[PDB]
Amino acid sequence: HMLSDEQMQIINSLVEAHHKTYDDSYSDFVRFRPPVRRLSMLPHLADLVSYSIQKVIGFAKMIPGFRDLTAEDQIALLKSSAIEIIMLRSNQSFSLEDMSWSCGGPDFKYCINDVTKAGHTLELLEPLVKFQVGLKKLKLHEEEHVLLMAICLLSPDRPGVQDHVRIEALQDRLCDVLQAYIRIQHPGGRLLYAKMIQKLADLRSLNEEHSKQYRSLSFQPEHSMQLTPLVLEVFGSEV
Amino acid sequence: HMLSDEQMQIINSLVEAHHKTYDDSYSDFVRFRPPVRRLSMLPHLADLVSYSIQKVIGFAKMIPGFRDLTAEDQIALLKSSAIEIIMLRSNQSFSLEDMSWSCGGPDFKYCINDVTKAGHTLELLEPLVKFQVGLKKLKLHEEEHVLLMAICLLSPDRPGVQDHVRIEALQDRLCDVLQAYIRIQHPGGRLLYAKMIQKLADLRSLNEEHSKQYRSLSFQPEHSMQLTPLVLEVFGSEV
């Protein structure tokens, strides 16, 4: 068969928005508080994560159907899927070779240890890399990666969503464009769609673990003072 | 006459603490979010001011009598004198030549315009420089500059101080060490002490104006998100 207009249009919007909010050169990383290899890497990663959040918001506002949801649902979805969308979009810079996120020279090429200096442990960093690898190997098309994020951000099963019915609907309309795309445009994606949906489940475990480690961190004022106002707002819990 | 032991000891504590919290090389400025000449200078100055606050706290904890005050008074004094202590200690890098704070190369040598890119106007920046100049000309001794800050931080007339009686007392004991020092150790300080006390009054006008401009700034989330958790805490109003 083949994709329809509304379906293909959703793809053009999503793919154009991802391009509008992601730079494969990472030219804005020089404006971050420099990295340092006592949580020496905290300042830089807080800025990296604060920066990403803004980019995910710019991307989210362009997902078809998001703008319509109420301000509270837009916020509920972002606040609970942010960390996961960041992990997904961060894969673009991950390298199965060095097993690290290569965003720049020795300076911006982050290893697992570098994130340990941010306050995280292997209990999170280990599965994270495993997920990063398992995902990289799926050599997704730009249209499948972009759809996967849009789908991850439209989970009606997020702590805080009230109109969990329309959010549920928008996500099904997207899982369709994806399933139809893998089946029509992706040679060899017979098992793909399922593996992609599975990656979404691994993100819950990751999103969960991070939440615990971050809660610990944020409780210590000497460390929370290193974070940015945005990070503190998205990851903090406020009705 | 001459100074006493307790008096001279206060001077040694104050002078040693200022040295312990101020670096005439500004080596930590590279760890700030880089400057940019839409409030392009905001990120860098927020980090410069956040950094200073920590230094003023380290200095304040070493002022004789401060540690004894209650946690609320220590906080009340800091929260309302912070901006003023920063303006005072910032004079050390001010230069009557270029009329700017020279902390580094063309990068860290701040002009009046650079602070305008932080969200401030001449209505504040103008008197600030006038104060910076008027103060620089007083060629104060390191012991008079350090005492002046300790005195400025022990004003019992701050919005929030409850034990405004002991704070009043500690400030008088310091104005003494200063008056006795100018009179015994500073050749030509016949009018000095008065000019110094006057600089404290100019700081109220400055501290006041800044407070208005900053309140405006902090009310706009697009700008407050550029500030640091510490800055937002010291300059925000919370009982």
């Binding site: 918001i57 506002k61 301000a71 916020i75 972002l78 606040k79 406020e238 | 989330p221 697009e222 407050s224």
Partner: peptide, 10 residues
């Protein structure tokens, strides 16, 4: 509350 977020969601 969520000042910043509300603002960024333009």
């Amino acid at each position: 509350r969520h000042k910043i977020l509300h603002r960024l969601l333009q």
